């Protein structure tokens, strides 16, 4: 009765989503053919959230994979968990976006989006009571950005009273991976700010720092980075699937976290993370999780909270716990580090505790934070944007596909105006 439609766009989302379903299945006990080989009953009590049912007691995911290059869709089908997807939900084309936002939005994505949405209406109208949507895409490219934000804009008009919980990888500060990350990110934020309800910002630079500093991993691959994001995508939606003393759906987070409708860009986290040796020297308890979660080195956003203020944060705990330990520790943070919290919000924290942990952990905890630090992900793009736009650096690849300079300017002012809304609360009062 609380269902989630999962869309994947581009190379980053699909290689995450393939790892996301390789995590949820291991939780609910589904195997790479869709069959059930679990131990407990709770794994199936609420399997209807992500997975549907099928004939021979199999379970098919509500997964809609989108792309414009078949090369990656095939990489998913040949993987371990590629066989459970619905082949009629592998929607793709040819003539890839070329890391051009316009191609994914206007020219090649326009000729494919109607085939994507007709699949969504099937999966959606087969739901008893829909909660919201869920997208995994990467800003900086064309497919995830143009064809991604397009579907968002079309889905809100068709399903406006539901949540569009977008998971989105933002560009990095130091080392780019596409030269025109700034052009594409400014335009996507112009769309996300107006057509989403909660957007989790992830930066790959901080994922590497998590893996190299804390986990003490030497050779981390992309299959390891996405092993962290999947863990966060799963904690936001645990108190739907499993029971607990104090539950919280997606909507409950958006209320307590978004005080003004534009400031829905969040800084996530996950606890506890340790090396393959150091776990013998720690002890798991609510305090040891709370410390990691409010530590700047644990955030996935590459943006230090201590250069800003927390407006309102969330902590979705999982495991047998005392609520006093939870309520008291979230209080101690506020009274100790009050300068990094807002004065005109009395309590800046909510809670949610599930009673069913992760496959092999006595307890776990997820962090979600709305912070005035998040300017820094936006001033960089804007300054990168104006230095390139002021001389029309790579622009004829965007004008020649049905755009004008007016649209690049709008996307700058909306990004700059989102910056100022965060600035006016950064300073004391």
């Amino acid at each position: 009765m609380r269902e989630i439609v999962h869309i994947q766009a581009g190379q980053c989302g699909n290689q995450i989503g393939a790892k996301f379903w390789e995590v949820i299945s291991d939780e609910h006990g589904i195997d790479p053919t869709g069959s059930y080989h679990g131990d407990s009953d709770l794994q199936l009590e609420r399997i209807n959230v992500y997975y549907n049912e099928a004939t021979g007691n199999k379970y098919v995911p509500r997964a809609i994979l989108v792309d414009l290059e078949p090369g990656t869709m095939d990489s998913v089908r040949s993987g371990p968990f590629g066989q459970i997807f619905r082949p009629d939900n592998f929607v793709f084309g040819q003539s890839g976006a070329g890391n051009n936002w316009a191609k994914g939005h206007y020219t090649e994505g326009a000729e494919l989006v109607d085939s994507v949405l007709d699949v969504v209406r099937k999966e959606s109208e087969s739901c008893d009571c829909l909660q919201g949507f869920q997208l995994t895409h990467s800003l900086g490219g064309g497919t995830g950005s143009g064809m991604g934000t397009l579907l968002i804009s079309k889905i809100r008009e068709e399903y406006p009273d539901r949540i569009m919980n977008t998971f989105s990888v933002m560009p990095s500060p130091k080392v780019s991976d596409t030269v025109v990350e700034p052009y594409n990110a400014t335009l996507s934020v112009h769309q996300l700010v107006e057509n989403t309800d909660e957007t989790y910002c992830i930066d790959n630079e901080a994922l590497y720092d998590i893996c190299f500093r804390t986990l003490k991993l030497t050779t981390p691959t992309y299959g390891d980075l996405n092993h962290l994001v999947s863990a966060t995508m799963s904690g936001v939606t645990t108190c739907l699937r499993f029971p607990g003393q104090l539950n919280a759906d997606l909507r409950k987070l958006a209320v307590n976290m978004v005080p003004f409708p534009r400031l829905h860009f969040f800084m996530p986290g996950f606890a506890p993370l340790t090396s393959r040796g150091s776990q013998q020297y720690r002890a798991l308890t609510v305090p040891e999780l709370t410390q990691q979660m409010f530590d700047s080195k644990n955030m996935m956003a590459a943006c230090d909270p201590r250069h800003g203020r927390y407006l309102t944060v969330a902590a979705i705990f999982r495991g047998r716990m005392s609520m006093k330990e939870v309520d008291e520790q979230m209080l101690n943070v506020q009274n100790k580090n009050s300068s990094y919290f807002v004065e005109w919000i009395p309590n800046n924290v909510k809670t949610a505790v599930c009673d069913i942990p992760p496959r092999g952990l006595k307890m776990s905890a997820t962090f979600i934070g709305n912070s005035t630090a998040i300017q820094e992900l936006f001033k960089r793009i804007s300054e990168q944007f104006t230095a390139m736009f002021r001389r029309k650096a790579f622009l004829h690849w965007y004008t020649g596909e049905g755009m004008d300079e007016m649209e690049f300017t709008e996307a700058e002012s909306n990004m700059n105006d989102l910056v100022s809304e965060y600035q006016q609360y950064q300073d004391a009062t």
């Binding site: 409708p261 534009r262 300017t409 709008e410 002012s413 809304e421 600035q423 006016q424």
Partner: protein, 367 residues
């Protein structure tokens, strides 16, 4: 340009059939020009001051403020400034059944600010229609419905799904505007009347508990007045050009979802109206705090109404507002909220200037 404040006015409408049937006590009183409110709790009597107060409650008392009076007190000065070249804005505010779709447009027998302003403008122009200054008028008439824009002067096609929506876009200099708006040329008051009639026939209205014909869509009536002045110059003449914009706004009402009992589409549009008005209140409070020297950001972008009226609430225009209130006890809370927003709108100022439109040609530089 120089600082100029927003002219705030108030109007107390008379009892309606509903307040008479469910007999309620008069609570709003005018202490000469102040507007006082005597709460049934009788803890205190509030008193609010305004630049102007209108008492159209009675039909006998000295102080009766009729439609021509409201015009000659509020709208004619804006016509003076428009002829001076300034942009002007006027917008209504209030709760459901307060008389916002009456003060501005009026009935066929008691016309409002819109027809009086258009007629007076055209007549003054005809009077001043000398060979020196050639005048041109264009108009538009659009609305806002569930956060979507619609053009009222565009006849719907042969279908029901004909409310073809437009979108807003930011020109980097002229500010926000509507893409695809069928601006129409204006010769005279008769053509203005015809266009306006077609528009109001197309506008979204409906019946409810607290009104038989209530507006479920915000309405903006825009005039663009261009004066091309002749002058003796040694070269080509007719460079002196003044373009001024007049923007008249009829907003929708608060509407609690209990009195005006509704379900479905009525409720949905009732929610959207409510959200737009919330954002408007936030904008007004933010501009008031700007007037006191603090650092504030104005949430223009949180709604299409404020987005398309950005340059008028603050910005560059001689702005005014007309608050509308009922005199009964059942609407005391909405009356007080409206009056508070009205009085804290008075502290707003905006930098209005003459729109010479000669920057970097010769004349603004010579200035």
């Amino acid at each position: 340009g120089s600082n100029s404040q927003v002219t705030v006015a108030v109007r107390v409408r008379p009892f309606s059939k509903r307040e008479k049937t469910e007999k309620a006590s008069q609570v709003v009183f005018t202490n000469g020009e102040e507007i006082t409110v005597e709460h049934p709790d009788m803890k205190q009597v509030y008193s609010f001051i305004y630049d102007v107060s209108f008492w159209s409650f009675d039909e006998c008392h000295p102080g009766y403020a009729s439609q021509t009076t409201v015009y000659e007190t509020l709208a004619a000065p804006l016509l003076d400034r428009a002829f001076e070249g300034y942009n002007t804005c006027l917008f209504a505010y209030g709760q459901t059944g307060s008389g916002k779709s009456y003060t501005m447009m009026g009935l066929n027998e008691e016309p409002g600010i819109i027809p009086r302003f258009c007629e007076d403008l055209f007549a003054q122009i005809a009077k001043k229609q000398t060979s020196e200054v050639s005048y041109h008028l264009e108009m538009s008439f659009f609305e806002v419905y569930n956060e979507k824009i619609h053009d009222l002067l565009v006849c719907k096609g042969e279908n029901g799904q004909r409310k073809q929506p437009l979108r807003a876009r930011e020109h980097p200099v002229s500010g926000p505007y509507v893409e695809g708006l069928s601006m129409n040329v204006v010769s005279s008051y008769s053509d203005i009347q015809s266009w306006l009639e077609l528009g109001n026939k197309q506008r979204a209205t409906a019946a409810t508990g607290m009104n038989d014909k209530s507006s479920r869509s915000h309405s903006v009536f825009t005039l663009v007045m261009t004066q091309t002045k002749t002058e003796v110059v040694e070269g080509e003449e007719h460079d002196h050009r003044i373009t001024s914009r007049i923007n008249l706004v009829d907003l929708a009402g608060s509407e609690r979802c209990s009195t005006a009992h509704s379900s479905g589409q009525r409720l949905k549009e009732g929610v959207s109206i409510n959200k737009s008005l919330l954002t408007l209140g936030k904008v007004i409070s933010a501009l008031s705090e700007q007037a006191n020297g603090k650092r504030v950001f104005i949430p223009y972008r949180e709604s299409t109404l404020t987005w398309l009226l950005k340059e008028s609430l603050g910005g560059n225009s001689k702005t005014a507002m007309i608050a509308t209130v009922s005199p009964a006890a059942s609407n005391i809370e909405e009356t007080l909220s409206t009056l508070r927003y009205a009085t804290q709108a008075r502290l707003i100022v905006n930098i209005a200037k003459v729109n010479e439109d000669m920057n970097a040609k010769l004349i603004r530089e010579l200035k």
